[PDB]
Structure 1
Amino acid sequence: MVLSEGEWQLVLHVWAKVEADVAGHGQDIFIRLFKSHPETLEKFDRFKHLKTEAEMKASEDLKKHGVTVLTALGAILKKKGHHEAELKPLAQSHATKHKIPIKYLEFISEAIIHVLHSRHPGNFGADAQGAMNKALELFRKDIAAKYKELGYQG
């Protein structure tokens, strides 16, 4: 699949807003993910002890992790589809070291859309959400293909 320049513009326009507060968006997204799909929390040995949203918000390590994740995702989105090089190491660590099923990538994609919808309604209307979903589907599709080449079905 391929996004048009118009769709990329919608994606990058709302992403520019997210970059005004990467740490904050990172926390909201992971808290949403962990609360909505608690099973994903078990994949993080560093955070699986967190019991409440309050503890999650107060975790300095979780906040730093969120920044690392969103920074990596932002770099991929800014490539506008030409992300082969960026995807290689990400696909290897998540398939081989962390063992993250494609299903879980769908869950975090849902969390990202939910947070952008809540925080940026004016810049995240129907068309913008469709563009973001398409960009994330492309990401998940290419990651899945790499998973297979690497020997991980998940």
Structure 2
Amino acid sequence: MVLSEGEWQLVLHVWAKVEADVAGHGQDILIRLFKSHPETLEKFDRFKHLKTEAEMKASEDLKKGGVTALTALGAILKKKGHHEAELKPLAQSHATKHKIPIKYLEFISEAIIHVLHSRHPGNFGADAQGAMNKALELFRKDIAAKYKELGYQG
């Protein structure tokens, strides 16, 4: 679909708050993902052995991974839909090296929404959440199309 500029501004205004502390937001988001959908943890060979939330919070590797993913997503969001160049390497690695189904991208999107709803009620009311959902749906739609071009059903 296509977001309006007003919708993009709602997305970017909450993202500005994430950027006060991307590392802490990334920890919360990955922990939420792994608690809600434990099968997703199996994809992370570096830290798939972690057993508890306490171990997850203490993991420097998990923290760095959250920073990497959220920073890449932030760069995509800041393109306001003009993200073709950014999606190419990401789709290739996630399709072919990491093997991340679209369903798992849905799960991480749900975790992002959950954490922003909890942390940022001042910038994540209903209209802002709808805008973020629309941005994440666009991201997933475009990645899914690239997955198919790359030979991965997703």
TM bucket, shorter chain: over 0.9
Q: 2:75 & 2:123 partners in 1: Cα distance?
A: 20
How many pairs align?
154
- Report the secondary structure of 1:122's partner residue: coil
CA displacement 1:27-52 (0-9 Å, x = unmatched): 00000000000000011111110000
Q: 1:146 & 1:20 partners in 2: Cα distance?
A: 32
CA displacement 1:2-48 (0-9 Å, x = unmatched): 00000000000000000000000000000000000000001111111
* TM-score of the two chains, using structure 2 as the length reference: 0.99
Please tell me the root mean square deviation across aligned C-alpha atoms, in Å: 0.4
Q: 2:48 & 2:95 partners in 1: Cα distance?
A: 19
Q: 1:65 & 1:100 partners in 2: Cα distance?
A: 15
CA displacement 1:70-94 (0-9 Å, x = unmatched): 1000000000000000000000000
Q: 2:36 & 2:16 partners in 1: Cα distance?
A: 26
The alpha-carbon deviation at position 122 of structure 1 amounts to 1.3
Percent identical among aligned pairs is 98
Other-structure match for 2:152: 152
- Report the secondary structure of 2:122's partner residue: helix
Q: 1:152 & 1:36 partners in 2: Cα distance?
A: 25
CA displacement 1:65-124 (0-9 Å, x = unmatched): 110111000000000000000000000000000000000000000000000000001110
For structure 2, which runs of at least 5 residues remain unmatched after alignment? Answer: none
